[PDB]
């Protein structure tokens with residue numbers, strides 16, 4: 378299944394001409410047309426939402442923000458964390474801490490005005506987002522990567538205690554996903570060792 382959000386397909390299927398989010402190409406919950414928006418950096422505006430409200434994000438920070446957009450919109454497994462009473466929303470998707478930490482590090486000197494990027498905006502007539510709070514650095518907005526990942530999208534994400542049973546929006550998620558859906562920990566960690574070996 379896919380999420381029952383604005384843009385999602387009914388069911389995951391291959392998607393040949395994706396411009397971004399290609400991690401999900403051969404089984405995607407987004408149509409390729411959605412990806413066109415993300416093909417060019419700097420990314421100013423995705424759908425009705427401006428990404429540059431406190432300035433233009435550094436490239437690596439933008440990359441991380443794009444990875445989460447691609448997951449929500451295109452991952453064939455996001456719906457496994459579907460909120461049953463709000464079918465466009467996810468809850469408690471387990472993110473790897475290393476992922477959240479690298480992200481924070483990438484964004485630490487960038488600026489932001491929404492502690493929670495989903496709720497903390499003024500939305501105008503045309504659906505476009507405007508800061509209410511003040512622009513501050515990410516390093517002021519959140520105390521660390523963990524705090525950021527638990528805050529940015531409310532209940533959507535959590536930070537796993539496990540370094541293996543967690544998503545980081547790269548090919549290793551194929552290892553994680555097998556075990557997410559003590560024992561499972563060791564299974565995952567062995568599987569992950571094989572993965573790292575196979576990739577030269």
Ligand SMILES: *[C@@H]1O[C@H](CO)[C@@H](O)[C@H](O)[C@H]1NC(C)=O
Pocket residue numbers: 408410411
């Ligand atoms: C994207 O394509 C799908 C089917 O190919 C279509 O249903 C949808 O309206 C398109 N979205 C936009 C924004 O053009």
Ligand SMILES: *[C@@H]1O[C@H](CO)[C@@H](O)[C@H](O)[C@H]1NC(C)=O
Pocket residue numbers: 520521523524
């Ligand atoms: C991260 O920051 C939060 C909030 O300040 C704090 O509780 C926590 O100890 C810090 N470290 C981790 C790994 O969460």
Ligand SMILES: [Cl-]
Pocket residue numbers: 394409
């Ligand atoms: Cl196409």
Ligand SMILES: [Cl-]
Pocket residue numbers: 398399400
């Ligand atoms: Cl990529």
